[PDB]
Amino acid sequence: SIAQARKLVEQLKMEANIDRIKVSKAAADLMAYCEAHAKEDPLLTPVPASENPF
């Protein structure tokens, strides 16, 4: 019991004590990463259909 509780506690501490961020920052970065590679995405950017891969 005291042992399991402790085991739980240290895990909750692990989940608890971390460098969180706000959603607007986190979200911006996603838009960022995406908009940054939007052209390199062959499924977004219909690569010159001639004979490339398929």
């Binding site: 739980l8 506690v9 909750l12 608890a16 969180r20 607007s24 979200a27």
Partner: peptide, 26 residues
């Protein structure tokens, strides 16, 4: 066991509240 139990309860909330706090935008 209460120390641990009580300590367990608060921990979940800080996680709860911590998430909540960052929910500044969608």
């Amino acid at each position: 066991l209460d120390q641990l139990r009580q300590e367990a309860e608060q921990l979940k909330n800080q996680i709860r509240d911590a998430r909540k706090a960052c929910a500044d935008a969608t």
